[PDB]
Amino acid sequence: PYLIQRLGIEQGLSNNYVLSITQDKQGFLWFATEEGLNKFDGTRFITYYKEEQSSSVQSITGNELNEVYTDPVQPVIWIATQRAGLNAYNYETQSFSVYQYNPEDPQSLITNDVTHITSSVQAGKGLWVCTYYRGIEYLDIATGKFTHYNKSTVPALPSEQTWTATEAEDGKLYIGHVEGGLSILSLNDKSVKHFVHPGNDVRCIYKDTNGNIWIGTSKGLALFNANTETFTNLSSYIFSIKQLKDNKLWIATELNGIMILDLQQNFEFIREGDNNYSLSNASARYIFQDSFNNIWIGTWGGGINFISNAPPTFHTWSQMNESSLSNKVVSSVCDDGQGKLWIGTDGGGINVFENGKRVAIYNLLSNSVLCSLKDSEGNLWFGTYLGNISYYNTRLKKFQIIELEKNELLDVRVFYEDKNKKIWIGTHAGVFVIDLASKKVIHHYDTSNSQLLENFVRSIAQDSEGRFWIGTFGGGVGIYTPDMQLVRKFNQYEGFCSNTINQIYRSSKGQMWLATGEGLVCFPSARNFDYQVFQRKEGLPNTHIRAISEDKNGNIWASTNTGISCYITSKKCFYTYDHSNNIPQGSFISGCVTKDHNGLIYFGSINGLCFFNPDIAINSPQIPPVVITKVRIPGRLTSREKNETAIPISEGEIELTHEQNSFNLTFNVQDYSLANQVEYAYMLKGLENSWYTINEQNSVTFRNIPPGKYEFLVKARLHNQDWSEDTTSLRIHINP
8 A cells, every 4th residue: 555665874863773764944843852853865875973171162962852843934943952051953053052950040941851742822932842851841942041840949840740732722632641530721811620530641731723632642532622622432552643735644653554544434554564555563653744745754763664655666566465466476467357366376376466456366287377368258267277178158167177188287388369369379389270159269370381481489479450469489470461471570680689589569659579589679560670779878788678468548568578668659758666665676567567447557477467657747746846955075084084074064154274175965856756856967167168967966076176267057856857947056166
């Protein structure tokens, strides 16, 4: 159901025990961990740690953090440390301010273990700060001074240990106590309605955008209305609840990862595991949705998990799942015109699928299903390895159907039905033509009794003039008239690109397409025998074509050794797709393709049955803006100083000294979905007035640049699109 990308140390994250997440007003995501503050730039994390001997710089005041929180109004990330007070990072000015306990006030913070932060009703007028030990603090950001709510000042309180607190009602403050149950405080009254037992350790209070009061406790989630003062209620620890754009309730549990309560049920889980569609740990801590709608997950041990805002365009079927293939390699697929797919495997039997669910497996003689055909009468033909035809009649039975005498065992690998209800059958032993209407066999062509070129038939298909194009193993293809007069043939040493021709395809436009060992070949008109070979040089890696289909429009799609590629007949060019787009990380199996009654296309591979749409629409992914995230001078080897100085970009420009005339700018794209699949190009006006690409990297380092004014321009683009007109710029002045 979901595709879950992972992020931790490999990406630079300081710690894998992630507890809180937000996004600053300039798009960057901040992560609070059990050791360090991390700001993710787009590819890599920047960690913030407590400073030591440096009563010079000021940083966070303690490494163990509880929460991060974006000020509604100001360019500030508020940081709740668990043992050192409240911290506040202004990302605009880039400096840390601190709020600690001071016995010399004490209109200062009462105790410096902060567990939660939220803004007041009219935002940025103040913020609420919960403590573990000594009650709730209210900071007036105007004065910079705390008012204390605890049982020294509100004797009506049942407890001063607090996890969260929010003004769920205008001037009613809802408090979750540390194993105390929840309290409601009317501020205008200083009276308390306190509930005990839901579960008693109340860890989260959440107001739905619809005004529903959700509550996360140690004994499960409960819905609340102060309307009637009653709860309503699999019952494990809950850490945070957020309703997403989906209008779905996403809840972070201690043992079962994530649950989702879909508000159009008038539950569903994402647990821990080790795969594309599972969490990296059983205890999820925090959930956060992007400005881009990406879902980010804080995991108590297993770093960050990330779910992209848009679904994968490509899918793959492959201890038994609902949709688990009973073998890892798919060698044939076949659509009966009734809504099921019979998937043939090279190890299991046939897995029949309907609506993404295995509905039957098949014991059939030999369980290496290498080819399949739906006949015009609507029955099904599967050829196996060293097993004859296993014929499935849609009168529920399946009979075996022999070929050679003493019922000899044949290596069948292609079935072709012609305009005339004959089925042509490619064998290692030549061709057999079997009459559909009645008698089971007409012809058997070979090296000895016909003009057939080789016996090892692999691939057979029909002309718009009705000639039979028969392909072989290692012998190319030959065109035969229906009486098996050789019309013309195509060899490697005759002139053709390849001898291993893998599939022959008549497109609906009437042209013939061949998947060869080294090119996708097209004969634009069967009144000619002219042909075009598409290879490396014309926008197609890799060159070894396995299977072909065609979409709603003109375009023909091909499976290859590396990916899936698409020939846009409109534009006269290629779209390539690769593991980057969620494709099975194998090579694809030759000829193994089928289409949906809905237009969906399926290619088989050594890694599952992969399937997709007409989401070349991938042009609609808008060109994403480039953000320049860091400039730093690369350090001289002199070997006395770590951390090589970073120059801050102020007014969209940068002043460097003569000394710092070498500099390296890094750039990112803020949507992490698109990180996977963006190429960058730069131009440095004032040095060279021309565009350069840069492969697999997001930083450029210029060295020993002469004094002057320059301007760095950098633009991105996605996998299948042209370079944008739009650029992002940085003006650069080098002094002497």
